[PDB]
């Protein structure tokens, strides 16, 4: 229950391992979310061009993983970006930004 | 046959529709029907036509 | 590329969280957009700092 005292009290390689694992797990979970949304919208099937994707240029799970990294670390290359087509992508964008700021803050305070 | 789009696109990563019309202006005198493929690029994109 | 309120909401998220996809970007046409960009960046850094310090 005193989890933050444990997290500070871990020796430095252990603490680095915890925080890189938490960031990687968040990236992979929201990568799964983006990939699932892109499949359910049909963006993974090749298409001629009538419909517009929830997120542009999501062709596989690798695209979803790169995109999840881009949104959570706020790099935002823009080759894959959220469009206004499906509101579920907007909700997942909100949730990912909120939890990314949250866990970035948690790690930041713990190692401060 | 393949060319690069001569000039900067109004959008950062132009959509297929944007690219087909840009290729049509650049190479087919605006005739979109002769544009056979497009590949989005950064402020540019590649044109495929006969 | 601001076509509706959804585009404005995605753009506000992009500027405040500094993701910046760039499909919707501020141009140099109207200075009111520049002023709102300045104000949003200032208050975004401000409330991000407030939350950050509170949960530290």
UniProtKB/Swiss-Prot annotation, chain A:
The record marks 104 as: Role in the control of polyamine-mediated channel gating and in the blocking by intracellular magnesium. Changing residue 111 to L: In PNDM2; has severely impaired sensitivity to ATP and markedly increases open channel probability. A motif (Selectivity filter) lies at residues 74-79. Changing residue 8 to M: Displays gain of function; increased open state stability, reduced ATP sensitivity and increased channel activity; almost completely abolishes high affinity sensitivity to glibenclamide, an inhibitor of ATP-sensitive potassium channels. It is linked to Hyperinsulinemic hypoglycemia, familial, 2: A form of hyperinsulinemic hypoglycemia, a clinically and genetically heterogeneous disorder characterized by inappropriate insulin secretion from the pancreatic beta-cells in the presence of low blood glucose levels. HHF2 is a common cause of persistent hypoglycemia in infancy. Unless early and aggressive intervention is undertaken, brain damage from recurrent episodes of hypoglycemia may occur. HHF2 inheritance can be autosomal dominant or autosomal recessive. Residues 61-77 dip into the membrane without crossing it. Phosphorylation by MAPK1 results in changes in channel gating that destabilize the closed states and reduce the ATP sensitivity. It is found in: Membrane. Belongs to the inward rectifier-type potassium channel (TC 1.A.2.1) family. KCNJ11 subfamily. K(+) 2 binds at residue 77. K(+) 1 binds at residue 74. Disulfide bonds join 54-86. The chain crosses the membrane at residues 10-36, 87-112. This is ATP-sensitive inward rectifier potassium channel 11. Homotetramer; the homotetramer binds four ATP molecules (one ATP per subunit). Forms an heterooctamer with ABCC8/SUR1; one KCNJ11 homotetramer interacts with four ABCC8/SUR1 molecules. Interacts with ABCC9/SUR2. Residues 37-60, 78-86 are extracellular. Inward rectifier potassium channel that forms the pore of ATP-sensitive potassium channels (KATP), regulating potassium permeability as a function of cytoplasmic ATP and ADP concentrations in many different cells. Inward rectifier potassium channels are characterized by a greater tendency to allow potassium to flow into the cell rather than out of it. Their voltage dependence is regulated by the concentration of extracellular potassium; as external potassium is raised, the voltage range of the channel opening shifts to more positive voltages. The gene is KCNJ11. It comes from the Eukaryota.
Curated annotation (Swiss-Prot), chain C:
It is found in: Membrane. A motif (Selectivity filter) lies at residues 18-23. Residues 22-30 are extracellular. K(+) 2 binds at residue 21. The record marks 48 as: Role in the control of polyamine-mediated channel gating and in the blocking by intracellular magnesium. Signal peptide: none annotated. Residues 5-21 dip into the membrane without crossing it. K(+) 1 binds at residue 18. It comes from the Eukaryota. The chain crosses the membrane at residues 31-56. Phosphorylation by MAPK1 results in changes in channel gating that destabilize the closed states and reduce the ATP sensitivity. Belongs to the inward rectifier-type potassium channel (TC 1.A.2.1) family. KCNJ11 subfamily. It is linked to Hyperinsulinemic hypoglycemia, familial, 2: A form of hyperinsulinemic hypoglycemia, a clinically and genetically heterogeneous disorder characterized by inappropriate insulin secretion from the pancreatic beta-cells in the presence of low blood glucose levels. HHF2 is a common cause of persistent hypoglycemia in infancy. Unless early and aggressive intervention is undertaken, brain damage from recurrent episodes of hypoglycemia may occur. HHF2 inheritance can be autosomal dominant or autosomal recessive. Inward rectifier potassium channel that forms the pore of ATP-sensitive potassium channels (KATP), regulating potassium permeability as a function of cytoplasmic ATP and ADP concentrations in many different cells. Inward rectifier potassium channels are characterized by a greater tendency to allow potassium to flow into the cell rather than out of it. Their voltage dependence is regulated by the concentration of extracellular potassium; as external potassium is raised, the voltage range of the channel opening shifts to more positive voltages. Homotetramer; the homotetramer binds four ATP molecules (one ATP per subunit). Forms an heterooctamer with ABCC8/SUR1; one KCNJ11 homotetramer interacts with four ABCC8/SUR1 molecules. Interacts with ABCC9/SUR2. This is ATP-sensitive inward rectifier potassium channel 11. It comes from Homo sapiens (Human).
């Amino acid at each position: 229950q005193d989890v933050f005292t444990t997290l500070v009290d871990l020796k430095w390689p252990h603490t680095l391992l915890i925080f890189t694992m938490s960031f990687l797990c968040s990236w992979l979970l929201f990568a799964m979310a983006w990939w699932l949304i892109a499949f359910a919208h049909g963006d993974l099937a090749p298409s001629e061009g009538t419909a517009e994707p929830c997120v542009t240029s999501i062709h596989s799970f690798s695209s979803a993983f790169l995109f999840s990294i881009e949104v959570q670390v706020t790099i935002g290359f823009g080759g894959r970006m959220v469009t206004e087509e499906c509101p579920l992508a907007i909700l997942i964008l909100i949730v990912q930004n909120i939890v990314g700021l949250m866990i970035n803050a948690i790690m930041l305070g713990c190692i401060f | 046959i393949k060319k690069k789009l001569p000039f900067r696109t109004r959008s950062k990563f132009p959509r297929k529709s944007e690219c087909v019309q840009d290729c049509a202006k650049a190479f087919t005198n605006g005739n979109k029907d002769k544009i056979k493929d497009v590949k989005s690029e950064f402020f540019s994109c590649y044109c495929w036509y006969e």
